[PDB]
Amino acid sequence: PGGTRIIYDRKFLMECRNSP
Amino acid sequence: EVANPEHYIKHPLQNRWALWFFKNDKSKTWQANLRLISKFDTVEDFWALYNHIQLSSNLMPGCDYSLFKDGIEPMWEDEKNKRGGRWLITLNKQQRRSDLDRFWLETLLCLIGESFDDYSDDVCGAVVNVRAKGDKIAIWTTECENREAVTHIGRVYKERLGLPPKIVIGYQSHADTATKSGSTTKNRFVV
Numbered sequence A: 001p002g003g004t005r006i007i008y009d010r011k012f013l014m015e016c017r018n019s020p
Numbered sequence B: 001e002v003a004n005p006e007h008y009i010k011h012p013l014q015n016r017w018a019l020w021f022f023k024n025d026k027s028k029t030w031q032a033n034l035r036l037i038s039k040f041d042t043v044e045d046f047w048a049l050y051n052h053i054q055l056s057s058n059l060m061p062g063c064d065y066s067l068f069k070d071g072i073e074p075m076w077e078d079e080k081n082k083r084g085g086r087w088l089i090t091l092n093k094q095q096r097r098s099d100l101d102r103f104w105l106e107t108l109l110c111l112i113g114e115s116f117d118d119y120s121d122d123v124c125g126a127v128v129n130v131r132a133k134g135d136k137i138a139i140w141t142t143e144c145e146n147r148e149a150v151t152h153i154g155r156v157y158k159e160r161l162g163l164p165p166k167i168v169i170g171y172q173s174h175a176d177t178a179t180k181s182g183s184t185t186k187n188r189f190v191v
Ligand SMILES: C[n+]1cn([C@@H]2O[C@H](COP(=O)(O)OP(=O)(O)OP(=O)(O)OC[C@H]3O[C@@H](n4cnc5c(N)ncnc54)[C@H](O)[C@@H]3O)[C@@H](O)[C@H]2O)c2nc(N)[nH]c(=O)c21
Pocket: B030, B031, B074, B075, B076, B077, B129, B131, B177, B178, B179, B180, B181, B182, B183, B185
């Protein structure tokens, strides 16, 4: 198969603030 | 008992990324104008880097920014780019003011957010090229023969950029870069 591992969506990354 | 992670640990990314900068000089080997800036493997470290650098639109035309997975140099010759290709986003003069910056950032997010499901493993990196005749942005993948993974990435990407759906984009393999004279550059896939 494969492993899950880290996937971030837009909102979250933007939510982590910085350059709007 | 230990402390709670969400409270103090940083947000780790799938892969560690490296940001490279290119400065034209048209009087030195292409490789020699290519320089590494720094790396990072967390969301926070990503923004720290992004926040302190010029917006692609403010760079001197002829320069490029390039974000690739640690271990993969931003050039064709690499073991991981050799057999690959790229989805190209060709912008017009006007778009330097309205889209370049936002488009490039969305590319960046797609890369570090691993926004292509398992197909995000075929991704090598992306590069923005600031040029007076028209800017360009492109996502590089390792195998241009992997149509399933390649077509998937193109679709999501084009959709993430939000540009008018009637506008088609092509995917080209690096190995076919014209070498004769113009020789007409072409696409393996289109979306
Ligand atoms: C991404 N990349 C670019 N260059 C170099 O940078 C040039 C400009 O490439 P660019 O992507 O930054 O594109 P740019 O906007 O600056 O402008 P431009 O399109 O006008 O020109 C590149 C194109 O010219 C054509 N070209 C180059 N040499 C020939 C040739 N001998 N015959 C016919 N066409 C050629 C190809 O279609 C090629 O893709 C290339 O022609 C090449 O020397 C690279 N060299 C190595 N060794 N590895 C790389 O990964 C690499």
